């Protein structure tokens, strides 16, 4: 039941009922125990200057690209501060990303690697689903021969990452369930088994492919994806990965990809396989990044100029978007406070999409 | 009318008229039959007339009740020994129709009611169900399934058809 | 034996109704009618026992009320003094408006369409030609309604007043569905023939509305019903022809606007031509800001809500029950 | 030993209550509270007791408190029998029930083990599916046809074992006969099945159910849709269906190595955890001078507007009608024909990504009798009743159903377009008939519906086409649209002062410093203010009911012009909505005999409500 | 029904294979007083536990014991069964193929994949069973077959290691010269032309490469060749031929499998709630022949991606 | 047989085959042309059909 050393460690904001319990009876530990000598070694890696570039490269050594996008995958794991008020509040640390673009990108090979890390990962697809197919799986029991209610797919996604493929080919009712989770982070069951709402938090991430197999230029980006654009703009950050007609990286292409296949052995970079596994887990509970006054001058200054574009849009989701991404970067490199710098590349990650949107 | 059939109408000549729902599949009762005692080798014969539960096979070999000396001098056929020799027996028909009241008047608040039918020999294979016919009957009672509640039935004599 | 449940009107707030068994006896047979109240004098018992075996240790005994005096909580024909006082009205001339003056004083104006309802239920004679044909003894009514009207109150007054009046609703609110089918009963499991409301309302008046939200299943039924007054069926092993001598009164809904254009009613309505042909009278309501009508109506509304010459209705229902036969 | 010890438990407890009761002086109660307990019960003769656990924790320094709290099942007759002698010492048919309260420690279903049986543990939860009232015998008069057929006797416990072995009739031990059904003392009980709270459920886990029986006095105290605290005690019911579970099954093969001989009537057992209780409280003068301060003021109308949703920053008219939805109408009687309904219905369709759910969460977050659901996975029969059958021999037990249980409360349902037509008729039955009709495979039934419904749907394209009408945007039928009173279209712009004010307001919420922004009232004196306001019952006694007519006429004389952009067949119900809206305004004002100023504010309220529609 | 007790030889298609679970044969019983071990042999479907003791020493004595069974001392047996559908070639002109029950015991278990072509030989024994209670004419015998030996047509790959008698013929193929051009000439030679087309399909038959980087992803060594053109090329002459020679070859059409058909399904298990699979569930480590992908369901396209 | 359109209230017109819910037996359910064999068929609204 305790966490593996290999894959990721669960949060403590969910276990905290049984952390409040389980002191009464001596039990298993459920938490990957941090030893002593490697603690300074964590503080050794924390003093690295090139940490912001070393870490994203070290995630997936199979594809040599998307260094901002892999960083969002990294910042998906350092996600936010779970702020609950004295009454109400309940502001989670989720960030939710769709990525899209042309095939032959190994986008699925990204997600399978994401699926292996997550301690409660759920990997779904398209058109094998239904509205009943994610919750209230009420059915007949066999050996006791009763009618037993089962937990659904998002309850199996409660804590962790869900994964959805071919997002454009959902129904109306499927993808209508997503409105409740992206806004309220609840699920409302009210039929014959149980009439009681419940929450099921996850890190929602999905992908789809456009109408044209290649996105042509001289055409709006908002046109060539079959989403309602207020629901499309509801997401935190949206990526587009396209093909380029250049030549220089294509010589770098086949030398890299043959080397993974040639001499049948996994082999100028330091790639810590298991340092990051405990680096993320230690940084999860011991860090509560605070977002005090000095950032608020620049942040409000930055948001109105984002609002100034008018005549895709920018909504009040985009105001909440930046503060959950900025202190997540402050959760990287052991910062319990915010700084006025590190806010600019949080804009630039959104601008990394935006400068890809010229055509 | 079928709506008012009191307990004062039990086992009396009462006629009515309605709509026949659907028939049943024809079974067969027996009237005349020859039997055998499986130990004593004792044979009799049984006729019945009012076949409409009533009679069954007896439970003694019955050769003991005999007014002759040498036969009663010569054991136990017991228990109930009688096996019907079917090769020389006689048989009849049984129908089990079902009738429904006419829905033109007063089934407004309720659901429509119905009863259970049974016809004799030449009355079988007579009426295609659904037509408007009149039946003189006998309002009889059977028992089968703690307040000793018993379901209603009609012994049927003389259906006449519509013209 | 009769089931009884708690009164849904006077429930203490939040609680739920429950059931109890009532057993009838000899002179008490068939006093009620389903959907009413009752006032009973009950003695309170339980059943004796059924089959004690290995179960929970808790004894579970259901309780049964036997009742003595069944009463209604706090049937109409003519008499000799009621058939001679009958002739004191029927000799007169101005009984025409006085019938309309006693019809529905709730809805104020609209003299023609109130007269047409007064004529429709009042009945006709078929006068079947010997051997050849009977034409019709029924009145076929169309009423193009409008939201913003009390048109439901008219047909509400009909079912209260008339002898056999069955409101067959538009879509699924009643147990009837206007199409006969062989069904079993979940109370009892045998197949029972269940005729439609138009099968039910023979020599009666049925009230059906929202014709636009009626299926082709319903539309063939209404087509056959006004055609030859007889409904045929071809179910499982059964082929019969049941009759129907109903009189149809409508309550429609305009398409889009409250009154569409200068275009005619067949262009205004979304229904078809043969049901328009079989309809005889066509009542049209109007929605317009008329200065005199609004002062009358709005002050009638306030007078209805501060509460917080016509024939009395027992005599006119005695009139038409005696006359139409 | 144990005959002495529980009797020593009996006598020390007999010593305890017969002593002084409360230490407090003449300022307060002096003495003899438990002695006044019977003497006040002697006045009313209801034959039970309300005794504290806390005073029992005082005297013996917890030595006796840690004597009872472990094996209460051992201690049934000793606690009852000694108290019976206390009664006949002081007082004069007598049957007793012992109730406790004030348990210091409350746990959940997950904190229950088989080692906790016999002990006392308090569990709270969610009451669902109450059942009827049924008796219980516990007094058998059952003996054979031999002369002494008068054995008032055993099976007081949870077993149907009537006959004792050794009588002194001609009857033997094997002789057994039926119970006399006329000479006994019974009690009644009901059987509710509680569900677990949603504020305690862990990840991956559904809420859990448990059966509980309330016997005797504690019948009808239950309420489906309530939070309650229980008696600590607990029992175990034998089960049947746990076969092929799998497991090593216990058996009762008796000894045969005793009596010498010259078949096998042995049994097994497989039980289940149940629960039993006797006290259920349902938790879950000085401020009256404060409520006087809350009504003598005048700005409190403007104060109550801003004191609703401090998390939401923006417009206010949606906060008005929800507040008016919190205040009931008059629902008075009429003539014998049709009674008037007394409720208000606000139905809002807005843009996606507008934080309309903050309104939705706040309503279910604050108000009593509140039900939230964004029901699409829910059935149509989820808000209707379920004919649960065969909990016993003919249970027919009707559930609560998700619509009805918000009685005199707001039941808010989202996304009408995501639901189908059969609910919409069943909603229209609830919005017109105000009742629920049931014929579900057997037992026909009728129910009721007295709730207020708040709506949250979406446009077809998601946004508003201003050249199109509002009627081309609901995608539903007419009378469920025509039944709806207020509409509240919201669409937003950019404005550089407000765009900073939106930026300043949201980030300062995430500033956990200075997040204590102040409404003029607190939440619970506001909730107190709802309760005082309900007892006003306004009777309009103003001559301006006639002035209201031409005021309503000039609402229509300008509507007599321009039927182009969202015309309306200006309804008596719209005029009737003007009545019910002007009601709850004066209910907030603590004013009967409604002034025309209260009319004119409600008059312009529906005016700019349709200016939000007329485009 | 005259071949009962004989030793026979049948063939067909393995269909609806059950799971392997142990069959109890004899049960040990510890006395705990007389110290013997009682043994009960069961050849019926069901049975009962027995009495308190049946020793010779516990006998003729007043106090008999009271026993209980034991697990580790009993003898079990490997048990699994399946059904065989008719070969669908010798069926008469208007008939529907039947099935037959075959019990398998012991060593030969875990050797029969579903959907194959196999020669089953065994001995033909009845089982005491009749159908409905009223339909019993008095002596109704329900039969079965006990498996004895498996000889499969289309011998499965990755299951041999012998090479000597294999290379007695393989080296003659190797020393034949110009082998690679000879191969694609040999697979389905009954059409004219399309040698380069047959050459790529020869390479589709190979596949058979793989690599995982370890704590990472695999790479699939699979080939996916599509065919376009109409109609006088007779492509289906090759489509039936490919899934015929190749082991684990299922021939599929467009509409005859829906979006739920070729994938798995859930039904109630017979005698031994498992997931009953489809054709692609069946034809794993093999080649699926597919007709008319243009007319699939749009949800059926999503599974193919 | 008189028919208005193809549809009566519950009677079909063409040769319908309904399986018997008891015994699962195939039989001829009904219609019009089987009924009026050697007789007269009346059909209204052939083009509104």
Author numbering:
A (entry chain 4): 468 to 734, 739 to 782, 791 to 838
B (entry chain 5): 147 to 198, 203 to 224, 234 to 304, 320 to 337
C (entry chain 2): 387 to 460, 473 to 706, 756 to 772
D (entry chain 6): 103 to 194, 260 to 429, 442 to 463, 510 to 840
E (entry chain 7): 232 to 503, 506 to 538
F (entry chain 5): 437 to 485
Question: From the publication, what sentences describe this entry?
Answer:
Replisomes in all cellular systems contain a helicase that unwinds DNA, providing the template for chromosome duplication. In eukaryotes, helicase recruitment at replication origins and DNA melting are temporally separated. To address these questions, we have started to analyze the reconstituted DNA replication system with purified yeast proteins by single-particle cryo-electron microscopy (EM). We report here the structure of the DNA-loaded MCM double hexamer before and after DDK phosphorylation.
To establish whether DNA maintains its double-helical nature through the MCM dimerization interface, we selected all particles contributing to the ATPase-subtracted MCM–DNA class averages and reverted back to the original images, to reconstruct a full MCM–DNA structure. The resolution achieved allows for the discrimination of major and minor grooves in the DNA, and for the generation of a model of the MCM-bound DNA double helix. DNA becomes bent by 10° as it enters the dimerization domain and maintains its double helical nature throughout the MCM channel. The observation that each MCM in the double hexamer binds both DNA filaments likely serves as a measure to prevent directional translocation before DNA replication initiation. The resolution obtained for our structures allows us to detect nucleotide occupancy in the six ATPase sites and reveals that Mcm2–5 and Mcm5–3 maintain a tight nucleotide interaction that tolerates extensive washes in nucleotide-free buffer. Conversely, Mcm6–2 is found in an open configuration, which likely favors nucleotide release.
